[PDB]
Amino acid sequence: EYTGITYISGPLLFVENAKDLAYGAIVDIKDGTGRVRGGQVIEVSEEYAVIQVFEETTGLDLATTSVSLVEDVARLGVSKEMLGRRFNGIGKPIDGLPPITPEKRLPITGLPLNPVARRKPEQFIQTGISTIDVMNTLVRGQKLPIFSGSGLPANEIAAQIARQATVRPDLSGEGEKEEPFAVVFAAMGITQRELSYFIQEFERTGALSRSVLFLNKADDPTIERILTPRMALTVAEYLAFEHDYHVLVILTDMTNYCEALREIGAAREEIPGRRGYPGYMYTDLATIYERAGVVEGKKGSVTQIPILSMPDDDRTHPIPDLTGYITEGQIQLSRELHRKGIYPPIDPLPSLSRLMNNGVGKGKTREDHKQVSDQLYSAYANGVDIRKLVAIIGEDALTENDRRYLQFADAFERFFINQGQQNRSIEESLQIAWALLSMLPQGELKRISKDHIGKYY
């Protein structure tokens, strides 16, 4: 609550006698007007300390600068009472409803659990789509990345399938007793426009009535921004991990994760190693895709989903490298795809959930899915060859057998991949594949077994 502030940079502020404080803390600071702002507790040395004002900066004076000690580490209140609440960045009551009932003020970062507990996520999951459930599904707790474009229909295709998602234990042989549906979404650096496109999907159909919001606009303060995700992130845990519910964490443009980052080191003196960024991102970032998985004994499992855009769609950047290193999959979007009108414009092989190849098929989703999942993959792409070779010979200039492998691709991207807002049940989604496969007389598919095709086909 002291005064005498020396050395002030932007939303930063130093204060002596910092032996009562400790890095990892925050308190509200008051200049002259007595305005209540804030500031994180950094460098608590003998001489002075380091604080980071919530707001941008304007409002710090030389005379007064006392501070009301909030709490070394602050954490929002957790509970099951948040089935439609709304919060931004830090995550404070903006939805109008009463301050969330605090159950336990857990650290926004409880770090990973016993690695011995962690199990392989293999509970099949639908998303109201075909292509994104057949060729590449998503297993419970599986941290699946989504390579998006920095200005692509991302923002949309994001929240689009968001609500579409629906967990189906039924097909496995269980009910929704221990398998509840919990939707958590948190963005950052959002345009005033977009900040409004979001709030829309929830209000659509029974979407917000079972979810909580979080998103620190880029114009907002850069402080809550970083942690912004960690909030509901650490909070989803109390859901599936503490009670055994089933949560879905979905990142959003880590552009923020790093832009915001730069400031921390840019001030903290944290020298940026490669690509002009902090020489300890891997680590700090790792702690991210760790909040997803499964433990021995608990069925409750939260599924994790990263989603970001590169600087110029360069995978050589951290934004991609990092992920493409810890994430168990890959799912990008191409200009091409969308240019023709494909929506969702999602490529084939370029996108795929690394660990959704085992949690499918027998018992899980559609027995024959086992081989069905690797059929349309090698079979489809096979046609993408006679797709750019028209100018070579022509339409009828090509054989029947291989030419046929063409009509497929077009009927495949236009109808199969571009599925817009539609919501295809995990089963309504598998059928389609079959249907398309009919192009080639029963006997041309070398991927699946004659057994399965000689039936579903």
Partner 1 sequence: MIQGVIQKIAGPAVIAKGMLGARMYDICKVGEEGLVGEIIRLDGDTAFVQVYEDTSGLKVGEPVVSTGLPLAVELGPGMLNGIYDGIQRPLERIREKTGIYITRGVVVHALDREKKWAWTPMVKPGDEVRGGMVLGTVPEFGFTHKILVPPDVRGRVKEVKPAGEYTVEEPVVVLEDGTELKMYHTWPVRRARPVQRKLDPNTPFLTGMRILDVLFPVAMGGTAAIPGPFGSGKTVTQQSLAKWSNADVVVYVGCGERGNEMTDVLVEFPELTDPKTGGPLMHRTVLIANTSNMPVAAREASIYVGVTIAEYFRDQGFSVALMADSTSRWAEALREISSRLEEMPAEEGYPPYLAARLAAFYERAGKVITLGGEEGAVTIVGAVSPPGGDMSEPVTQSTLRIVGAFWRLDASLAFRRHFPAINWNGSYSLFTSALDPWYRENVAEDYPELRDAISELLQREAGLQEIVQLVGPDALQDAERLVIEVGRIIREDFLQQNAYHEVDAYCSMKKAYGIMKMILAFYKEAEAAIKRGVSIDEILQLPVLERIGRARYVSEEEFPAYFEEAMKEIQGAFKAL
Partner 2 sequence: RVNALEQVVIPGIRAQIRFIQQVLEQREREDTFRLKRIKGKIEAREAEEEGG
CB 79 within 8 A of CB 103: yes
Check whether the bond before 344 is cis (ω within 30° of 0).
yes
Residues that bind partner 2 (rule: CB under 8 A) add up to a total of 7
Query: Can you name the residues that pair with 185 across neighbouring β-strands?
Result: 213, 250
Q: Map the footprint of partner 1 across residues 202-241, applying CB under 8 A.
A: 217-222, 225, 241
Cβ contacts of residue 174 below 8 Å, gap of 6+?
none
Minimal distance, residue 314 CB to partner 2, in Å? 12
Q: Is residue 4 close enough to count as binding partner 2 by CB under 8 A?
A: no
Q: Does 272 bind partner 2 (CB under 8 A)?
A: yes
Partner whose binding site includes residue 443, from partner 2, partner 1, ligand ADP, none (CB under 5 to 8 Å by kind): partner 1
Closer to partner 2 by CB, 14 or 147: give it.
14
Contact yes or no for 136/176 (Cβ under 8 A) = no
By CB under 8 A, name the one of 273, 363, 420, 454 that touches partner 2.
273
Q: Does 282 bind ligand ADP (CB under 6 A)?
A: no
**Of 89, 143, 394, which Cα lies nearest the Cα of 292?**
143
Among 35, 274, 335, 362, binds partner 2 (CB under 8 A): 274
| Interface with partner 1, residue 24, by CB under 8 A | yes
Tell me which amino acid residue 301 is. Answer: S
Give the whole-angstrom CA distance, residue 380 versus residue 24.
52
Residue 227 or 331: which CB sits closer to ligand ADP? 331
- Asked if 427 interacts with partner 2 (CB under 8 A), we say no
- Please tell me the distance from the alpha carbon of residue 46 to that of residue 3, in angstroms, as a whole number: 15
3-state secondary structure of 186: strand
Size of the site for ligand ADP (CB under 6 A): 4
- Residue 88 in contact with residue 76, Cβ under 8 Å? no
Chain centroid, CA 109 distance in Å: 17
Binding mask 316-335 for ligand ADP (x = CB under 6 A): ---------x--x-------
Q: What are the beta bridge partners of residue 36?
A: 30
CB-nearer residue toward partner 2: 273 or 420: 273
Contact yes or no for 249/305 (Cβ under 8 A) = yes
The binder of partner 2 chosen from 276, 341, 350, 454 (CB under 8 A): 276
Smallest separation (angstroms) from partner 1 to the CB of 147: 10
- Say whether 13 sits in a helix, a strand or coil: strand
Q: Binding of partner 1 at residue 336 (CB under 8 A)?
A: yes
Sequence letter at residue 139: V
Interface residue with ligand ADP among 160, 222, 252, 357 (CB under 6 A) is 357
Contact, 66 vs 2, CB < 8 A?
Answer: yes
404 binds ligand ADP (CB under 6 A): no
The residue (of 7 and 23) whose beta carbon lies closer to partner 2 is: 7
Residue 269 in the binding site for partner 2 (CB under 8 A): yes
Task: Report the alpha-carbon distance of residue 37 to residue 16 in Å, rounded.
Answer: 19
Decide if residue 429 touches ligand ADP (CB under 6 A).
no
Query: Considering only residues 28, 178, 244, 270, which one is a binding residue for partner 1 as defined by CB under 8 A?
Result: 270
**Chain residues that interact with ligand ADP, rule: CB under 6 A:** 325, 328, 354, 357
